[PDB]
Design a protein around this ligand. Structure first.
Ligand SMILES: NC(=O)c1ccc[n+]([C@@H]2O[C@H](COP(=O)([O-])OP(=O)(O)OC[C@H]3O[C@@H](n4cnc5c(N)ncnc54)[C@H](O)[C@@H]3O)[C@@H](O)[C@H]2O)c1
Ligand SMILES: NC(=O)c1ccc[n+]([C@@H]2O[C@H](COP(=O)([O-])OP(=O)(O)OC[C@H]3O[C@@H](n4cnc5c(N)ncnc54)[C@H](O)[C@@H]3O)[C@@H](O)[C@H]2O)c1
Ligand SMILES: O=C(CCc1ccc(O)c(O)c1)O[C@@H]1C[C@@](O)(C(=O)O)C[C@@H](O)[C@@H]1O
Ligand SMILES: O=C(CCc1ccc(O)c(O)c1)O[C@@H]1C[C@@](O)(C(=O)O)C[C@@H](O)[C@@H]1O
Ligand SMILES: [Mg+2]
Ligand SMILES: [Mg+2]
Lengths: 357, 344
């Protein structure tokens, strides 16, 4: 009934529990125990939906609960917004034994994680992700960060949670465009690391799009296992997680944020990366049709913006524009389920990949 | 020239102590030709030692930027640290850069937390210019900035790649700060090293005169001693707050800048010694060697008459560090409130 993944990285270990109505289970927010305190960090969108339920379930178990409601937005993933959490913790005399609870998506997840890393140089930290993206991505790897006006995720810390609480019910309220955005990263795991999971996704995508409890539970479980594996082997293998992200960054940068969701840009970037793998001679068009066909059924774009031409991509795709830079490093699939980093690929290869679509 | 190698958290870094160290060849190792460096300092230290290190560094093939912050504890803030990030990004410093903390404990703490947080961690070299930061901030990995509702409440544990202690920089340090640092030097002798305390009884006059050879061993020994007790807490380490509970009370009641931290701790150490005899843990004769050595360092031995004992306890709220001998110490859980006022 309950899926469970144990993650052991950077010499610590935490569980990821996945089940519908998990917010109500007995010891759902372990290792929080009766008598301890907790500070829930959430945003203005999620607060009316889930804060009160989470607060009462914790108080039922003997936890003393405070909360802080931040504004909703990537533009609020700032050092100055995170300061407000420190104020809330201090006004309520939260000491080093408190637990910070990230009730929200990846934005709340990153900001609350860095707050838990920094408050008194480190307090306990429990993740409650409410987007599919953050459930299969933010739950593993320890990366926390806020943005700087001159660069995204340039201020943060490596910091692992004590546990991850994934109640599938919270997906019922998630905008359907966000759910497909998350599914782009789900499909990415199939292409770079597990061909059988990709095949499983070919046969259950419709159930996931319908929010089937049993299919969604296994999906999140397997993606967490796959990211945990590729992080445990690395700590440059973790770079394989940027499949479709170089092409996707160009789309996100050139179109402006919020216009294309991150997952939407990654979906078309994975197609373009599959097309770059064919051009070099490592991928078949039939393999590319399986990627295109599965993203189409996730209601994800498979071609880039009409507004953009191949020369709009390359400025964003380069590591830098320095004289000795200007290099294109890509992650390319070798099979469905296998991938490689490929350094210095021709601009002509890239252009052709983009033009083919 | 003294050297301490400290190994904590399965990592290792050196502390080099020598006069004219800023001009030495690889004094700012592991920085090498082709790499970048960002120096963080305050307005006081910039005219004195910036540009000198910059010239030693640029001659050695490293490309150098710097940022000069105002001098003061009030600038150990999250908003000031953001400006460090702004400077690094404006100059396109990537994850391979190195932050250089050229300053006292304030610059050290802020730059350390900036290096811990910038791209989730970049290299970080300490150049402490106060005696306090040489014997305290150079070991233990604590970095932080302040919050208005609490000092050092936003930070990270983050070890430096090296600590570069040029003894020449002490020549410009105000004598009140040098005496303030010596209170913490004396702290190590009382809580963990009796032989060092005796060494201090015979060399205090050399340290006050900035004798290179005495200062080099002094700084070396204090670093070794804290490195030991930091490695032990992996359960002691509370002993380094001897006289700091009393010291906070004086600092809190009188205000910043009026009493320097070491002066507050020095007079607080006496009060802890007199309470240690009151409960029966110290002899009255031993307390005179603590008082006599601090007086010869030009440190206060009496808490100001401007506060009554009843002013002290409100901040102290019972969980104290008290000396057992000169060279050994203990934390004692529940001590009477009446005992502390009787010490005054
Ligand atoms: N390794 C990592 O740490 C990691 C990994 C991936 C992404 N991230 C970061 O995550 C952030 C984006 O993640 P995201 O996809 O969650 O975006 P998001 O946090 O902004 O959430 C998307 C939108 O949907 C709303 N929402 C969230 N849950 C909802 C729910 N149950 N019901 C209704 N609405 C809900 C949110 O309020 C928000 O408006 C990025 O900043 C990214 O840098 C970090
Ligand atoms: N575990 C740790 O990391 C640790 C340890 C001890 C103290 N601290 C923190 O450090 C701060 C206090 O450190 P501090 O005692 O060095 O105070 P400080 O950094 O403010 O320096 C003392 C004063 O003397 C000036 N000065 C420093 N070096 C000079 C030099 N060579 N020449 C001329 N002037 C010089 C400084 O500009 C400053 O005004 C506190 O915030 C404390 O919390 C941290
Ligand atoms: O932020 C990123 C990299 C963004 C990026 C920008 C431009 C590029 O050319 C690129 O290859 C990646 O990825 C996120 C972190 C992630 O790489 C991890 O957890 O290690 C997973 C990924 O899904 C996230 O989007
Ligand atoms: O914890 C502290 C803060 C000093 C303090 C302030 C107020 C108090 O009431 C107190 O008991 C200690 O000590 C600092 C950190 C240190 O313990 C370490 O590096 O581990 C060394 C010590 O010298 C610092 O002052
Ligand atoms: Mg991604
Ligand atoms: Mg101190």
């Amino acid at each position: 009934g309950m899926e469970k993944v144990t993650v052991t990285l950077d010499e610590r270990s935490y569980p990821i529990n996945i089940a519908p109505s998990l917010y109500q289970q007995q010891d759902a927010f372990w290792p929080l125990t009766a008598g301890q305190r907790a500070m829930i960090v959430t945003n203005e969108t999620l607060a009316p939906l889930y804060l009160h339920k989470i607060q009462t379930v914790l108080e039922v178990s003997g936890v003393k609960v405070d909360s802080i409601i931040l504004p909703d937005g990537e533009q609020y993933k700032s050092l100055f917004i995170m300061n407000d959490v420190f104020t809330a913790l201090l006004e309520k005399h939260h000491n080093r034994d408190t637990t910070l609870i990230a009730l929200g998506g990846g934005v709340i997840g990153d900001l609350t994680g860095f707050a838990a890393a920094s408050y008194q140089r480190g307090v306990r930290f429990i993740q409650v992700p409410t987007t599919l993206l953050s459930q299969v991505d933010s739950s593993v790897g320890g990366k926390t960060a806020v943005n700087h006006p001159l660069g995204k995720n340039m201020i943060g810390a490596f910091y692992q949670p004590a546990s991850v609480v994934i109640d599938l019910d919270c997906l019922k309220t998630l905008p359907k465009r966000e759910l497909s955005s998350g599914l782009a990263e789900v499909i990415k795991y199939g292409i770079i690391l597990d061909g059988e999971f990709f095949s499983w996704l070919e046969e259950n995508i419709d159930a996931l799009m319908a929010l089937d409890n049993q299919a969604m539970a296994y999906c999140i479980r397997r993606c967490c296992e796959l990211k945990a594996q590729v992080v445990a082997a690395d700590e440059g293998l973790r770079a394989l997680l940027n499949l479709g992200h170089t092409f996707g960054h160009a789309i996100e940068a050139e179109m402006g944020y919020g216009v294309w969701l991150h997952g939407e840009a990654v979906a078309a970037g994975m197609v373009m990366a599959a097309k770059t793998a064919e051009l070099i001679g490592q991928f078949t068009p039939e393999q590319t049709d399986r990627v295109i066909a599965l993203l189409k059924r996730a209601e994800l774009p498979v071609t880039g913006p009409a507004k953009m031409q191949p020369d709009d991509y390359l400025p964003h795709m380069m590591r830098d524009k320095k004289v000795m830079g200007g290099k294109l490093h890509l992650i390319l699939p070798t099979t469905i389920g296998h991938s490689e980093m490929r350094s210095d690929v021709d601009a002509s290869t890239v252009t052709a990949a983009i033009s083919a679509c």
